[PDB]
Amino acid sequence: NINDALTSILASKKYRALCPDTVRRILTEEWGRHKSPKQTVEAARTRLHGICGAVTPESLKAAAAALSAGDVKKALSLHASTKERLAELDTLYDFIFSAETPRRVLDIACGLNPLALYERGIASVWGCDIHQGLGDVITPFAREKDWDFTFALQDVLCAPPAEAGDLALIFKLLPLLEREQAGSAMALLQSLNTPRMAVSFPTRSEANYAAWFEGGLPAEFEIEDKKTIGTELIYLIKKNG
Ligand SMILES: Nc1ncnc2c1ncn2[C@@H]1O[C@H](CSCC[C@H](N)C(=O)O)[C@@H](O)[C@H]1O
Numbered sequence: 001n002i003n004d005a006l007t008s009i010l011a012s013k014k015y016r017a018l019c020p021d022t023v024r025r026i027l028t029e030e031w032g033r034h035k036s037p038k039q040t041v042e043a044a045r046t047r048l049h050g051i052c053g054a055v056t057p058e059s060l061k062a063a064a065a066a067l068s069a070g071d072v073k074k075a076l077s078l079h080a081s082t083k084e085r086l087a088e089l090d091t092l093y094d095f096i097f098s099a100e101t102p103r104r105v106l107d108i109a110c111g112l113n114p115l116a117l118y119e120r121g122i123a124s125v126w127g128c129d130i131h132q133g134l135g136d137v138i139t140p141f142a143r144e145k146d147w148d149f150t151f152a153l154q155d156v157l158c159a160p161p162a163e164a165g166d167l168a169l170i171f172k173l174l175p176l177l178e179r180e181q182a183g184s185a186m187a188l189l190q191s192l193n194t195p196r197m198a199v200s201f202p203t204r205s206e207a208n209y210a211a212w213f214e215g216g217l218p219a220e221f222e223i224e225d226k227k228t229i230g231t232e233l234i235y236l237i238k239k240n241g
Pocket residue numbers: 051052053081082108109110111112113128129130131154155156157170171172173176
């Protein structure tokens with residue numbers, strides 16, 4: 001059954017750090033394609049491969065090493081998403097925090113971005129992602145710095161973020177979610193317990209993310225700002241209600 005397959009996949013070195021719900025989610029969808037378990041499992045592994053960033057145990061090790069040496073910039077360069085943001089990092093957050101600087105930030109599908117929030121003096125951060133390796137990198141650092149950061153191994157398509165905050169960051173995530181499950185992107189934004197959010201899209205290929213987002217954003221949200229900074233198209237939105 002699905003549970004047996006989940007147990008076998010989580011025992012492998014390649015996927016042992018993946019969120020169990022993620023493995024089950026993919027397994028369940030593949031099982032719906034009725035197949036000899038052989039086939040099902042193999043189709044699931046093929047999908048799990050590129051579910052976190054196509055992100056290795058080696059990259060995470062290096063990240064923690066650089067972090068343990070106080071080299072935050074180097075750690076950020078060890079994760080593809082934060083590395084490509086390095087050049088305009090401060091320009092980006094000056095934009096997001098221009099109006100108000102949040103006391104508590106929720107980083108949805110955080111990757112290693114929380115490290116950038118630390119250097120920005122953000123007091124409280126809660127981040128969630130599907131690879132424990134990410135939390136294994138940030139958590140020990142936060143502890144040393146006596147920084148209030150918490151990591152949750154959580155698949156947002158299985159359980160929405162339950163935490164409350166002043167601002168939520170949803171960087172380079174909606175495209176992936178929407179492709180995994182239609183309508184899940186806007187559903188996620190509605191589930192966030194924050195009055196404001198910052199959403200970003202990659203500029204490389206919803207062929208047109210701007211048209212998709214502006215035309216599909218639920219009525220309870222209002223777009224207050226839209227700007228392209230570096231490799232990202234960012235939207236500052238307000239959730240009313
Ligand atoms: N269903 C899901 N739930 C939670 N996180 C997910 C997810 N599917 C993919 N992710 C995570 O989404 C991230 C996309 S890369 C963007 C990382 C970070 N927001 C940044 O901008 O630097 C990856 O870290 C991936 O592991």
